[PDB]
């Protein structure tokens with residue numbers, strides 16, 4: 171099997187500048203007919219892959235002029251003349267020379283922007299859920315940057331770790347921010363033994379934790 | 389207008405069998421070579437199988453891990469290609485996409501939207517949908533509302549706000565799985581001059597169970 175290598179798992183870049191992504195093949199992709207069988211694909215979050223460049227340097231129809239490709243033998247490069255915020259996604263190279271056809275692991279393009287503090291919202295269980303015997307407390311930490319953030323849950327001051335469900339969105343294609351959802355799963359019974367519920371976030375935009383809480387007894 | 393459309397995915401029992409279909413249009417299907425590629429966490433994109441055109445004797449090629457279990461075929465009179473999968477294992481779980489090489493040297497020029505295959509002995513279960521309204525009072529300029537979707541299986545569920553009318557400040561997070569099955573949340577941020585004066589509704593559809601639920605977000 172031909173091994174396709176994309177060293178960088180991701181590359182940070184600021185909108186407006188040019189950047190390149192590289193790919194290497196364990197074997198020459200030059201065919202007898204004289205064509206070099208290496209293609210580049212883009213996969214935006216939640217969508218199917220899409221062809222950008224076929225056979226090293228041919229732009230597919232509909233692909234923006236800012237993309238170009240180069241290389242030969244076993245080293246290839248994908249360049250952006252000017253990067254745009256909407257270029258967020260994962261870029262894959264693929265050899266189409268021998269079976270089985272193989273893909274590189276991909277390189278995610280990350281757009282750098284100004285720091286953005288998360289907007290934190292906490293939500294007590296809906297009464298509909300309580301009548302059902304459940305008590306999920308939800309916390310949304312939205313539109314922040316950079317991507318790393320830490321969330322802590324406190325119940326009456328003491329930290330809880332089990333029963334916490336965390337989910338993250340990909341970088342937004344328009345404002346380049348990230349968002350996170352954190353859910354504390356409790357039973358109606360557990361929920362009622364306590365009163366203070368706290369969603370605490372630690373992000374680089376603040377020295378002290380961002381704190382949001384409410385009290386069941388209200 | 390070029391398009392490839394897959395169908396036939398869903399929940400399937402381990403050791404069971406399933407057939408995926410791909411319908412083409414907008415290009416000379418009979419000249420094209422058609423392939424299936426799947427995607428899963430860990431392996432990323434993985435080539436699965438290929439069937440050539442008639443001039444090339446309809447020859448098939450398969451990746452090692454599916455040889456003997458999967459069978460690819462095509463029907464040019466219907467501009468379709470099929471992927472028959474037998475003895476399904478948990479490792480076959482993933483998104484399957486149909487793609488084609490329309491002409492020599494073109495690469496995988498066209499791709500379908502993909503269809504999710506989940507191999508599991510668990511059973512289909514509909515979701516419960518809970519509206520999430522703010523505790524305190526707004527103001528202040530913007531208000532964030534939410535929708536909690538839990539207890540369903542398998543994926544996916546589609547969530548929209550006001551039947552699609554509200555799309556801008558929406559974040560629908562990836563589902564999380566544990567003992568209560570899948571739990572997914574979605575939030576929407578709107579001006580405080582929009583809610584609660586105007587009606588904000590969460591619309592949830594779970595194809596697998598044919599469940600549809602519309603829950604209004606009311607001030608608590």
Ligand SMILES: C[N@H+]1[C@H]2CC[C@@H]1[C@@H](C(=O)[O-])[C@@H](OC(=O)c1cccc(O)c1)C2
Pocket residue numbers: 201207266267268419420421489490491492493494495
């Ligand atoms: C190294 N080659 C070999 C194996 C992969 C790649 C590919 C290529 O050369 O493009 C193949 O052929 C097609 O995919 C093809 C050929 C004729 C018509 C058509 O629609 C598609 C021939």
